[PDB]
Design a binder for this molecule. Structure first.
Ligand SMILES: O=C(O)CNC(=O)C(=O)O
Ligand SMILES: [Mg+2]
Ligand code: NI
Ligand SMILES: [Zn+2]
Length: 331
């Protein structure tokens, strides 16, 4: 069995190996990468996503989200308070202001310490979930706006044609902006490219151990767990590495830098935070190996998780017994 300790693997594809996206994902899996739940892919030196980032300031962040925490430093939830629209140039200036900027630090480990000590005492503003792309149309390799769609994958594997579309999303971050513990919708893969700026630190639980994280979460967030049998779908709960270690939960960590891709694998729980002003692009995707995870994915039906148009068909075809309850949660 490859990668039996479920370590995060780092790949350095050549320019030739960077041509065929599906083939390379399958290669990484042949080496056991999926066992970690997360892999890093460093693009060949010949590749670029676009020529420059000099002309992005006029992108609008229609609904910046202030991420307000409740709880204790290592075990907290966050809610998202909607703020007034602002441009990416305005948001960058805000990220760099004295109130929001990254503090002085020694290295990534010192910054990580500071994050977990102090995150709850601040409310950073995240420009998350913006439909769009920063890949140049002429970038042919690993262009997250040109991937095979999940609807096409389902059709190819299962024979059923379905409605829906699959487009990327931009994330503008600042120091302390946080992504809560989650798996993807329908336990899909994700791919995330850090276009520019400061790093993003990731934490991940191996897919084979995801239920250990869920059991801890039910213990640590007992009201939320009574409310919903899949409350991690709400994407609000944070648990620190220290707390995970105290509770024996297997996990790994890694820091993504600008110019690097991360892939999350089906049912790989992940969480993390941004080091300072940055911009990432991410999209969900599927492979043949995903289908069995999609059929077994948990679902939130309490109403909170509220998701895209395109999840309807996935539930309807892969999970027909759950469909009626889930759809009630959507309405
Ligand atoms: O970058 C973020 O805020 C969150 N990203 C993801 O969870 C992802 O790419 O799957
Ligand atoms: Mg612009
Ligand atoms: Ni994710
Ligand atoms: Zn729910």
């Amino acid at each position: 069995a490859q990668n039996p300790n479920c370590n995060i693997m780092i790949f350095h594809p050549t320019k030739e190996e960077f041509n065929d996206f599906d083939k390379y994902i399958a290669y990484m899996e042949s080496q056991g990468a999926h066992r970690a739940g997360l892999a890093k892919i460093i693009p060949p030196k010949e590749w670029k996503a676009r020529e420059t980032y000099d002309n992005i300031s006029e992108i609008l962040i229609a609904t910046p989200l202030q991420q307000v925490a409740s709880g204790r430093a290592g075990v907290f939830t966050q809610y998202h308070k909607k703020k007034k629209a602002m441009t990416v140039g305005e948001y960058r200036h805000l990220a760099n202001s004295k109130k929001y900027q990254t503090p002085p630090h020694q290295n990534f480990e010192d910054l990580e310490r500071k994050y977990w000590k102090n995150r709850i005492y601040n409310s950073p503003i995240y420009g998350a979930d913006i439909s769009g792309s920063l890949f140049d149309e002429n970038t042919k390799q690993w262009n997250l706006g040109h991937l095979g769609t999940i609807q096409d994958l389902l059709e190819k594997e299962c024979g059923v044609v379905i409605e829906g579309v699959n487009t990327p999303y931009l994330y503008f971050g600042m120091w302390k902006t946080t992504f809560a513990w989650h798996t993807e919708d329908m336990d899909l893969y994700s791919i995330n490219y850090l276009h520019l700026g400061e790093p993003k630190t990731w934490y991940v639980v191996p897919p084979e151990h995801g239920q250990r994280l869920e059991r801890l979460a039910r213990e640590l967030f007992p009201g939320s767990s009574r409310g919903c049998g899949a409350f991690l779908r709400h994407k609000v709960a944070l648990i620190s590495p220290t707390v995970l270690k105290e509770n024996g939960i297997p996990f790994n960590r890694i820091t993504q830098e600008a110019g690097e891709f991360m892939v999350t694998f089906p049912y790989g729980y992940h969480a993390g935070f941004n080091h300072g002003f940055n911009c990432a692009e991410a999209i969900n995707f599927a492979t043949p190996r995903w289908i069995d995870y999609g059929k077994m994915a948990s679902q939130c039906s309490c109403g909170e998780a509220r998701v895209t148009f395109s999840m309807d068909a996935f539930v309807r075809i892969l999970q027909p017994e759950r469909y009626d309850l889930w759809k009630r949660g959507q309405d």
